[PDB]
Design a protein around this ligand. Sequence first.
Ligand SMILES: CCCCCCCCCCCCC/C=C/[C@@H](O)[C@H](COP(=O)(O)O)NC(C)=O
Length: 209
Amino acid sequence: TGFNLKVVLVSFKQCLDEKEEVLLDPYIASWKGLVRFLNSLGTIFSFISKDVVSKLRIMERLRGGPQSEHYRSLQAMVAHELSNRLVDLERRSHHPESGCRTVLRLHRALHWLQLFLEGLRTSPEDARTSALCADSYNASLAAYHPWVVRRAVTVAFCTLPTREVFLEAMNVGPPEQAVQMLGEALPFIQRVYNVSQKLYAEHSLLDLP
Ligand SMILES: CCCCCCCCCCCCC/C=C/[C@@H](O)[C@H](COP(=O)(O)O)NC(C)=O
């Protein structure tokens, strides 16, 4: 029953080393956990997250390929792809699937997840899970999606259960306990997101095609 979300959220701890580099292996591992979380929410969430599975595979290929060492961290990846002109900076052509542009999309998606869970964490007892999901989507990831894609994604929101059931489905006790867990574990995702955001901002990569 439900999903062991705490393990996945806490795994984001492993994504940052002492130098605050975002390590790609744990990043991919944590994201695979998030995909299993999404799968547990139902077929529509599996459907809309196919994009994320595809991008994780792209990153696994790069990390297993000849230049694997250069994808050890997002920092190493950026240095390697920029200096070797392996990133399409203006229009997608010769490197439509660079690690840089690919991780960018994973990162934007991560923001939705963290905003959704944080809204959930602080929600009143009467809040609807569907509204928390839509609101966090439209605040965040929707900005990068064409209106028609937003409509397709939105189909998913009404399939979510009540707040109580959704919280209990995290397998850590009643809603107030699940709330405690999110308070503990969310900071791990937020730190990874912030470090990643600043890295991309620093190199003017936030709008890669
Ligand atoms: C339960 C509430 C929170 C859910 C978190 C959802 C995370 C999964 C990601 C949702 C993906 C949306 C559909 C993909 C759209 C793509 O066109 C887009 C752009 O990638 P592309 O330029 O087409 O390769 N990718 C993203 C992640 O925005």
